[PDB]
Amino acid sequence: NYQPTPEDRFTFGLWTVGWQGRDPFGDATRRALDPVESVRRLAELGAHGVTFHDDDLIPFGSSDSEREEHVKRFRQALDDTGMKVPMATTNLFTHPVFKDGGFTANDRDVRRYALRKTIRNIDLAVELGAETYVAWGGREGAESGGAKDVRDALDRMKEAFDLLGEYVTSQGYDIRFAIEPKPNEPRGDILLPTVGHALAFIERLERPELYGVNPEVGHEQMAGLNFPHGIAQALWAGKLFHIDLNGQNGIKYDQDLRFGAGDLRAAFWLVDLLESAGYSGPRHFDFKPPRTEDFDGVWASAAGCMRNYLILKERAAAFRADPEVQEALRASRLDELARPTAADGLQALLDDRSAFEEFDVDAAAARGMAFERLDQLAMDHLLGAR
Amino acid sequence: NYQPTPEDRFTFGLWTVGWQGRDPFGDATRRALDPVESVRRLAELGAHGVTFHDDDLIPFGSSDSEREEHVKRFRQALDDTGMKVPMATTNLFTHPVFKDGGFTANDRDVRRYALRKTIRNIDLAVELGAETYVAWGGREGAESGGAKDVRDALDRMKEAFDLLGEYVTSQGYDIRFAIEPKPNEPRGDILLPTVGHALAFIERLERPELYGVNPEVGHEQMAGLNFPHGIAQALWAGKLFHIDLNGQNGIKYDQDLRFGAGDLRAAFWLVDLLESAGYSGPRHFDFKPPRTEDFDGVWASAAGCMRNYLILKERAAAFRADPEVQEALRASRLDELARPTAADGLQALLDDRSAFEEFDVDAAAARGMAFERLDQLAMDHLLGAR
Amino acid sequence: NYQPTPEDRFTFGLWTVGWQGRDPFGDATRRALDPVESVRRLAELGAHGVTFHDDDLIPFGSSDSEREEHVKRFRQALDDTGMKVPMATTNLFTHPVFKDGGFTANDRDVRRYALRKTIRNIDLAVELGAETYVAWGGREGAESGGAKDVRDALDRMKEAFDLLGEYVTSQGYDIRFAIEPKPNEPRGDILLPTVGHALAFIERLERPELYGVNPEVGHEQMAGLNFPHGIAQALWAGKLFHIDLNGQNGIKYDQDLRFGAGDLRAAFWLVDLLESAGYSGPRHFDFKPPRTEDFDGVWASAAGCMRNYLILKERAAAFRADPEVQEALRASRLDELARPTAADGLQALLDDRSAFEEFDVDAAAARGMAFERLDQLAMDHLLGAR
Amino acid sequence: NYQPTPEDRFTFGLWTVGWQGRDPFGDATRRALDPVESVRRLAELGAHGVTFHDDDLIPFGSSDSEREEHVKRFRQALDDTGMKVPMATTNLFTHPVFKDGGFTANDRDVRRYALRKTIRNIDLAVELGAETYVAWGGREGAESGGAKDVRDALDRMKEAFDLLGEYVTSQGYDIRFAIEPKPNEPRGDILLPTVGHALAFIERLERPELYGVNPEVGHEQMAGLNFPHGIAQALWAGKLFHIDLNGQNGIKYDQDLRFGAGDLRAAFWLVDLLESAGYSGPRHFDFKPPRTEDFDGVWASAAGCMRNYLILKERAAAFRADPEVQEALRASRLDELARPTAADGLQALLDDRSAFEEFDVDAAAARGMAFERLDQLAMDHLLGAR
Ligand SMILES: [Mg+2]
Ligand SMILES: [Mg+2]
Ligand SMILES: [Mg+2]
Ligand SMILES: [Mg+2]
Ligand SMILES: [Mg+2]
Ligand SMILES: [Mg+2]
Ligand SMILES: [Mg+2]
Ligand SMILES: [Mg+2]
């Protein structure tokens, strides 16, 4: 009954179910989880794999001998369970040294340290089989206007990503990069604040084919943007390498609710789009079980992420298969939207008197779009009323 | 006393001072202005020029003989005053035929009509000397998820802009295009909702060098974004072709307040950036005198736009010239941000033990950034307390 | 099949289905509806009744003879259909004379005119059988700080409502007033911007028992507030006299989508609360069929409002009746929330060593709240997955 | 030069300058401050006094002997410096036991513990001379709809505040309560989310004269509301007992910037209102020096709070004293707003044919309000351009 299997490609960060509940105003409400026990419990729930920051897996400051022991234990749990590691990332935000950023810190020696910390984890990610390496520049930004010259900061950001691309190509690694945007928090404003800004920045890198985006549901909604629309533009550009699924109730702090919570209808249209477009990457959940919960509530919340995806997948598929919906899509001229405006070319358009001189503007204006009937059919399908 | 001259390149849309005050809940409070009298009054205030939609200058449905008479009267007022016309645009949003968009309307015949209406005004813009042609896709979007397949819509949007680029290059016109983003209103969500989304889309056009952005202060702030940061990314990409200046109080309907109203400190950092970066284009005001005002209040509001720019220009210049500010910029390491992270290259970085193995992470973390002293110096300069 | 009947008490404003589609950027897309034909069509759909502004029913400036004819035609349509008129209101926002407000306009003669226009429609409302008279102060507010002394404005607002209460009590009318809050639009900020501000203001009126609130879904969500929470506080205070149902996608212009659109889960919790608390007033829809629609889409949208309420009513009732949900409510201690904290009194609490000196704070902190399992049960019920 | 003195009544929470910089994504960047050294440094800066949570001053779990020692050291620093303690409050949010709230936790034993923890600190506050006791219900709320029955929660909230009022009156204490609203964070939605909701709730308490509000600049702006307008309604109701001053850049996480940062023009209108209305309470700063700063930046940020208040005070006073501004206020009819609408009474209004039958609605509509000239005079004064 809406039961996930590893074939559904559901993945979770170690930092999600492992979040101890420490927020800006309160201490942790849960003990720390051993990464090995997280891998085991997620495998029992039907997950496909896990993801990690370097500092989730190897405590900061560990010696190279303790580091090998932490990786050894982790790799044994992966072999014991069949879990994969499709993505990894770097923590360039927790340690106080990163208080003004990593790649765009004003201090040059911090920027060089940030790059070396990243490169070391790229080696580990490749060793564990990760295909995508995510960068979330959570500290790249400012609280005040004079603290950061943004043109210089973008130069430094481009320099850092170009160097990472030079590193992976010189090593022969088969891994790609995905930039994860966020508009604000913990900085007052964060550089590359939306999917669009990240897509535009990638086109100025030396090797743009190596970079895509890792959009997160809640982050685009923190700017009041339509997340399915932003995902469509990422897919249109061929840049949706990875995705972070969760829930968010509007414009406020980053809630990281379980997927399906927050904006339910946006979750429906998101799943409809991902499945229609044939997205084949991981369905990754970047969420936080609320700090009200004990460990039983943690695993219930994680199970809820996958359950809600599978319910929405079923409802979206029934919606698209419904002959009455297919009729309504034609009534609203979705078929005409897919046809070229002027495949006959510019000169034919200019000579076409039916396109302007003899166009009946009042008759075209009187045509209703029938969008409300279509949207109520979508509502009926979502609610199981049809 | 903070008096503008045409050398300041202040420009106004005919639709700004000519706004009659009709909002979603109320009738017009002011009579219509003759475009000729708007040109005269703006010239008296010290403006450099005006901009127009086709339908601002030539009433919709006019015959080709009435059309020549409207252009004739307008051109005579420009000659009488010395006013320029640096930018023009198309109205693809007022007439009911555009209720589902122009370039991305679901109906193909509307899309072809939208292109023909645009091409006709491009010819007129070139005749009047405009160097930039703006596109604001105010109706390109949706209120519901199934009404618009966004990948198909982006195909149609790219097709339309590619055809416009083919037209201007085949005619030999010396004009460039600027896309004006807006996140919402009048559609529930608008395609290309921010500067970033517009910049990313331009890189997929056939002739990207012909297209840039026309960002508007209030529109990026309707998504809660930092407008100076977005302008910096546009300048970094070489794409700031034009700009719309106004004011907005946060995330709500598009207010189009006079420039300097709304977020005053963002206006200060904006002017600082435009002047430091040597932006040489028009300082265009897309604002609406509130409908509480009579015609005396209209011209007072327009004068206020230019006055506030010139006051902020003076304060920003004093800020940057202050030796104590220059000292504080070095104390916050703005100078180090401008220097390459690794001009020595990747291999040198990997072999540099001071960048990781021997990096003193606690000593670097203890360095304060001194951002608050710098920001209070900026506040003191803005308020004239220094 | 989810078919409304007049017993469901669904009502619609004449201005809702009659909205012609004129928005800040576009002309009307639909012809005007005769109020008589709106009454007939809504009755066919299963509505209980209609509501009106004075100017919806009697065009502004009508003579007293044309006024009687408009009322006569309307009353005949009500008799022909069985439709009721449970609520009426005044248009104090469309005419330019109200550009700075009605009750709080700076000009005293406008304030007196606003009161006389209101009193005249109260007489008509009582004649048609209305039990609630709504006030939406859409023009009471400001775009700038010095334009309105808010303490003086609140004095004038209290003066106006006190005079209306003196009028209805001296006439012996059995009608009550409901204030409808909105945070902004069309003014930059509107006085009494939320349910809370309106509730607080009512307690300073001379006869507070005559006044309550008419909250609107989308308006509280324009401030990012939780609409079900605000309704609960209104019910707690005994002040929910009326309600406006619609949909809104977050913090932006007032969309007035059909009910069920926008925040679907908030609509579910709203219906759960209204039905559990025994709200017996009208279920009024203040919505706008999008201007993309023709008249067939108008009535489809109106039918969708009622359909979605009835589906959500069914899902909320199944949720509350589910024994497993009742078990989960006890697991989350909703039962303990309903019990007094200290029915034993202050002195008993102070002497109770188990409340502080001997309270085991670590054992209580370790109790999980089980909120996520409860919320997934609510999701399963909403989606019909259970 | 804009130098504060204790006569300016500037106060700071111990938790403000003492914030160690630990945010949801990062560790502390500053060592803990001894409360004694904070008192000394603030006195040197010109502060009037300090405020505290119980747990700021006495570490949680301290024995009654360590508790007396912490109070002794604190009282000696107050005597050494002349600093006052005008306000105190309870920490009912940091410890995990409060994860579902204090006064409205679902668990009854937690609610009783929360009351006992509060009462103990009220005794201490009275001993230190505090006149106001603040309650910020940061954990009172929910992330999901079924977790909290809000009517039951408001019953529990009223019960708790009624018991506190019974306690202070039975002890003969001369102290009043102030509720501090916040719309969200750390809970998904917080009960009593705005000034208005708090004002309305106070009117249902048994002894309403004992309770007022402690509004915070940034918190009302997290709902996109106009903070000066909300303060005016609090003053109108006679309920502004205390105020929290800081800065916030729009709708996002609670930034707690130094006062004057964020919305500068709202800070100007706030100071204008507080000084015009004769607010005599403490000017309290609830702010966080950004975690980018070292201890030198902490004290620079604190000094900036007071400096910006004094600059804005000077500019607001010059604005109101300017004869040209006084002329413009009369031109905009601010004088008429202060005069009663109908001091002649209801019957005189009904018989006044100039108020309706013979009112010239077109002549009144044509009057411009002259708000834009007034607002540019306010801008000129704020910027020192006049
Ligand atoms: Mg997030
Ligand atoms: Mg993420
Ligand atoms: Mg605008
Ligand atoms: Mg514009
Ligand atoms: Mg509305
Ligand atoms: Mg309404
Ligand atoms: Mg705060
Ligand atoms: Mg506070």
PDB file of C-alpha atoms and ligand atoms in Angstrom, chain C residues 15 136 180 214-216 219 244 246 254 256 284 286, ligand 6:
ATOM      1  CA  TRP C  15     -19.649  41.320  -7.801  1.00  0.00           C
ATOM      2  CA  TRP C 136     -14.513  46.604   4.076  1.00  0.00           C
ATOM      3  CA  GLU C 180     -13.636  42.753   6.887  1.00  0.00           C
ATOM      4  CA  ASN C 214     -15.856  38.989   8.328  1.00  0.00           C
ATOM      5  CA  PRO C 215     -12.436  37.412   7.689  1.00  0.00           C
ATOM      6  CA  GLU C 216     -11.391  36.461   4.158  1.00  0.00           C
ATOM      7  CA  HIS C 219      -6.539  38.504   3.017  1.00  0.00           C
ATOM      8  CA  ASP C 244     -15.443  35.134   2.960  1.00  0.00           C
ATOM      9  CA  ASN C 246     -11.682  31.909  -1.546  1.00  0.00           C
ATOM     10  CA  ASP C 254      -5.332  39.720  -3.780  1.00  0.00           C
ATOM     11  CA  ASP C 256      -9.616  35.913  -5.041  1.00  0.00           C
ATOM     12  CA  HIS C 284     -19.929  33.145   1.413  1.00  0.00           C
ATOM     13  CA  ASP C 286     -15.773  36.332  -2.401  1.00  0.00           C
TER      14      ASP C 286
HETATM   15 MG    MG E   6     -14.042  39.879   0.830  1.00  0.00          MG
END
